[PDB]
Amino acid sequence: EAPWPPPEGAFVGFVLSRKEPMWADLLALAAARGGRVHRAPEPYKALRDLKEARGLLAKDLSVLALREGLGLPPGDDPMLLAYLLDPSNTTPEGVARRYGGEWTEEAGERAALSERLFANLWGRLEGEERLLWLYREVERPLSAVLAHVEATGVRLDVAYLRALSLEVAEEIARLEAEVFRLAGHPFNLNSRDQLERVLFDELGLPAIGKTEKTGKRSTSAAVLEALREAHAIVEKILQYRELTKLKSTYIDPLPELIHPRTGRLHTRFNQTATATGRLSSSDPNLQNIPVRTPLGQRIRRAFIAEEGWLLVALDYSQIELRVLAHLSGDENLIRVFQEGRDIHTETASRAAKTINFGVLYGMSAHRLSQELAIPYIERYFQSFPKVRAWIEKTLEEGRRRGYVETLFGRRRYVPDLEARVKSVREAAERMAFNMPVQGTAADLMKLAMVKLFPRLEEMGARMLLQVHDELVLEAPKERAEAVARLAKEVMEGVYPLAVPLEVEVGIGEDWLSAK
DNA sequence: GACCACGGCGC
DNA sequence: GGCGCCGTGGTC
């Protein structure tokens, strides 16, 4: 042990009062180097001494620093190394338990664990040049970008949501009142246990589906959809469920999450959470804001730009299919994207839509038989033979090596590619050949975020949200159209493929208007 | 108060 | 056919 401050390039360790760095109280700050732990007397002011957040969960501490007006960029993170070695490595505890060490609740030990786990996992990346490139060029600099993004937050029209809440509440009460009549008695409509008995035991409706673990008569939307005219209560329940779903998840909780220092809504972009290399948003989740239903579109208008600013929404156009074309090298599918006609009138030479989106997931003919209503695909695979050839090629290589790769080299280990149970094996297969498609699209989006962000700062623009294949920026009205033009070009040319990457742009005062 | 499994559902 | 969060129900 040595007294604060630590020397240059030391690994950091810290303890928060809660997982959300924007709401966290920094309880303890420490730093280790050469096995020598430096503990801070007072954590908050000791942040001024550090010049780079370097260690486990570095981005989180960086977000807290940005919250306190301190410029503390995140550098190395053993979590990012482990994630590239294996996407199943998602948490410091799991990483420590796998590669040695104990993840505890003391800042000094965490700083020591960070230095060690790094040297361990860094030595494992020796010779892994494609994994090292992803670290230096994508993941490590992206953490610095996501730090600024999380600390920036998005402006939210709270008053509009408070108003919308009262409006939805009355339609919910109206629907709940009618369900009670048709049932002949009141009951908890939010309780699926109670709803099952009313529909299937009391009113005697055909119970079709059944729950997985416990085996109960399912009352899901899919099951109820077939009963939506068998009785009016089924129609009223599904309407009721949509409103309660949106109100209890978005309309009510979100206005309670406005930060007192920024006055904006702050989310967390988890960098090591998915098995494909995708990002995930939590606390709250802003990657699943409603947009489908009419009421959902109303909720999205609550997400507004600052006064004197505009939102810039950039969406990739079928990036996965374009990736699939590049990975397969299918001459026919490439020609469809290359010429620039409607991608689906051309792959028809609605039936063409569903499998052109479903082939990425391994959509069987069973669901297509139900979706398009024809009785019980092969026509598609003969139009694009290399696509089928690529799937078989990926699965074959997946069984040998034990993992599948993205374009840049991001790997996911699929163990059940040789299971003796067909349902298990074919399930793992669908996970196996989807990862290179979803992972590459994730790699492209990530790399696009890395290249674009410093261009935003130099133009006085902001990066607010990422929705897998979508970006939401914030730029002053003056620079708004210039930012949209530069951002569009950074995203489309992030990494030149055998097919061009298309991006649609949109500018507005809110998320709904811009998109 | 806290915790979690489950079903159901938003993207 | 990759995610996070809701209320319910149960437990501590």
Per the CB < 8 A criterion, the answer to whether A490 and A502 are in contact is no
Distance between CA A491 and CA A160 in Å, rounded?
Answer: 33
Rounded CA separation A424/A276 (Å): 19
Distances in whole angstroms, Cα of residue A208 to Cα of each of A204, A211, A221, A271:
12, 10, 12, 40
Q: How many CA atoms lie within 13 A of A429 on its CB side?
A: 19
Euclidean distance between CA atoms A394 and A74, whole angstroms: 36
CA closest to C1' of C6 belongs to A249
Phi, psi (degrees; rounded to nearest 5) at A371: -70, -40
Across-strand partners of A474?
Answer: A311, A462
Which residue from A92, A78, A93, A91 is spatially nearest to A125, judged by alpha carbons?
A78
At A130, the amino acid letter reads R
Nucleic strand B under 7 Å from the C-beta of A274: no
Residues whose CB falls within 8 Å of the CB of residue A60, separated by 6 or more in sequence, listed in order: A16, A21, A24
Write down the architecture of domain A1-151 according to CATH.
2-Layer Sandwich (3.30)
Residue A209: nearest nucleotide (C-alpha to C1'): B7
CB of residue A347 closer than 7 A to nucleic acid strand C?
no
Task: Please list the residue range(s) of chain A that carry CATH number 1.20.1060.10.
Answer: 152-268
Q: In Å, what is the separation between the CA of A288 and the C1' of C4? A: 8
Q: Which of A35, A31, A87, A84 is nearest to A58 (CA)?
A: A31
Cβ-count burial of A46 within 10 angstroms (0-12 exposed, 13-18 middle, 19+ buried)? Answer: buried
Give the resolution value in Å. 2.7
* Vertex A484: Cα angle to A479 and A487 (nearest 5): 115
Q: Where are the alpha helices (DSSP H) in A275-383?
A: 294-300, 319-328, 331-339, 343-346, 351-358, 365-371, 378-383
Q: Could you tell me which of A254, A288, A252 has the C-alpha nearest to residue A466?
A: A288
Q: How was this one solved?
A: X-ray
Residues 292-311 of A with CB under 7 A from strand B: 292-293, 296
Q: CA A361: distance to chain centroid?
A: 17
Which tokens in the block code for residue A450? 């890395």
Angle, vertex CA A450, rays to CA A122 and CA A308, nearest 5: 145
Comparing CA positions, the residue from A177, A185, A189 lying closest to residue A202 is A185
β-sheet bridge partners, residue A111: none
CA distances from A67 to A44, A50, A151, A259, A322 (A): 11, 15, 6, 10, 39
CA of A195: how far to CAs of A183, A216, A447, in Å? 10, 11, 47
Classified by CATH at the fold level, domain A152-268 comes out as Taq DNA Polymerase; Chain T, domain 4 (1.20.1060)
Residue A178 main-chain phi, psi, to 5 deg:
-75, -35
Extract the runs of DSSP E, i.e. beta strands, from A231-293: 268-270, 280-282
Tokens of A34: 């050469």
Q: Which nucleotide is nearest to A221 (CA to C1')?
A: B8
Does the CB of A188 fall within 7 Å of any strand B atom? no
Check: CB of residue A432 under 8 Å from CB of residue A418: no
Give, as ranges, the nucleotides of chain B with any atom within 7 Å of a protein CB: 5-11
Beta bridge partners of A38: A2, A31
Q: Please, where in chain A does CATH 3.30.70.370 lie?
A: 269-318+442-514
A271 Cβ nearer than 7 Å to chain B strand: no
- Which residues are A404's β-sheet partners? A412
**CATH class of the region A269-318+442-514:** alpha beta
